[PDB]
Symmetry: D2
Subunit: 115 residues, 4 copies
């Protein structure tokens, strides 16, 4: 129900081995760790969570773009790219969070489908 | 030294009256308020800080996109748009952080010039 | 070897039933029709061409964004989105042309892989 | 009534000295040259046309992105970036066409204001 896809606009390729950390806002208003992983050779990260665990809430997907660019000899502008959204508040949905990265820019979108 | 510009991809216009909050990362790794404002009729926010105040450090610019779309009657995806970056004295002096907003997407870039 | 993917930034969904026309620059410098189709329920258009037919050249992928938005009651800004690129000039590659659409904006990227 | 602004997502700067050609769709459905220029040090191109000349019609703005990246020593994907749109008198009067360039991607938006 939660997938992350990352592309590299400089290379025209998937962004491989990009660390992703997901957090969920807790009752006390702090960000609790929720899931993490690294993107594959296709720039995809699957298997973060299950429909049982992915309850309603406010989630933050942090994509470690600085570590990515530094590993290729680019000193980038952003520390990371952060996507914050309410999920599942009208029931379960499937979310794809996609990001396109450049050293001084990024764009992100969400595709939200109803299984 | 720090300007923010916000544009609306649905209406093809500046994004007017958008709240923007800027934070600087503190010693204890929390985010301390630094500056804030609302974008003007041109979608710009100027006069956030001064050169003296804007020292090297990690800054977060939070744009209240959710309120913006709600005001237009449109249901958005994001709670806000975040832009987190290090200000470094070596690089050029003036930072423009621009954001292009759609309900389920945003794009941001930095223009860093002398 | 040539795939097109289209997303809608307003809805947070694939852009379905979007017409796509591909042209190849001919010897006389005119644009020759090459392939066409419509995106699926997943916002994807596969099966445009074959590795045999997709020779070196300059290609134009025209995405009929105006027809798309008009069909949803938006009067959009652009007539279409056009992506023009040299393909296969160092041998065969696989190309994904992706576009993210808003009424007054679009973004496009290419993912280019070597089979 | 028509301005173009081009930014570079790799360097975080305006895209300077970029050739821009503008065409208007003619009676016979071909593209006739209308205006052209090179972006300034701020990545902007002003003074393309006048209100009198810029009548309703279909216009194409072609940005020579390939030459821009080649000049920087970078191998790009696109031959150019194209933006094709109708100018309509009902809508606001001033059109800004902005483009954010990367080697394998570009984004464009229209800011249409009065
Ligand atoms: O397989 C996919 C999936 Br799913 C999503 C995207 C989205 C790309 C995109 C973004 Cl994320 C931001 C701005 C512009 C763009 Cl064209 C691309 C591919 Br290729
Ligand atoms: O006056 C300006 C300045 Br300064 C900067 C930008 C950048 C716009 C943009 C962004 Cl922010 C993300 C993705 C694509 C785009 Cl065309 C636009 C205008 Br109009």
């Amino acid at each position: 129900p939660l997938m992350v896809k990352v592309l590299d606009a400089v290379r025209g390729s998937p962004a491989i081995n990009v660390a992703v950390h997901v957090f969920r806002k807790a009752a006390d208003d702090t960000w609790e760790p929720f899931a993490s992983g690294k993107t594959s050779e296709s720039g995809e990260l699957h298997g973060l969570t299950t429909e049982e665990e992915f309850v309603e809430g406010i989630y933050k997907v942090e994509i470690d773009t600085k570590s990515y660019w530094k590993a290729l000899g680019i000193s980038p502008f952003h520390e990371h790219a952060e996507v914050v959204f309410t999920a599942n508040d009208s029931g379960p949905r499937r979310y794809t969070i996609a990001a396109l990265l450049s050293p001084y820019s990024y764009s992100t979108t969400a595709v939200v489908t109803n299984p």
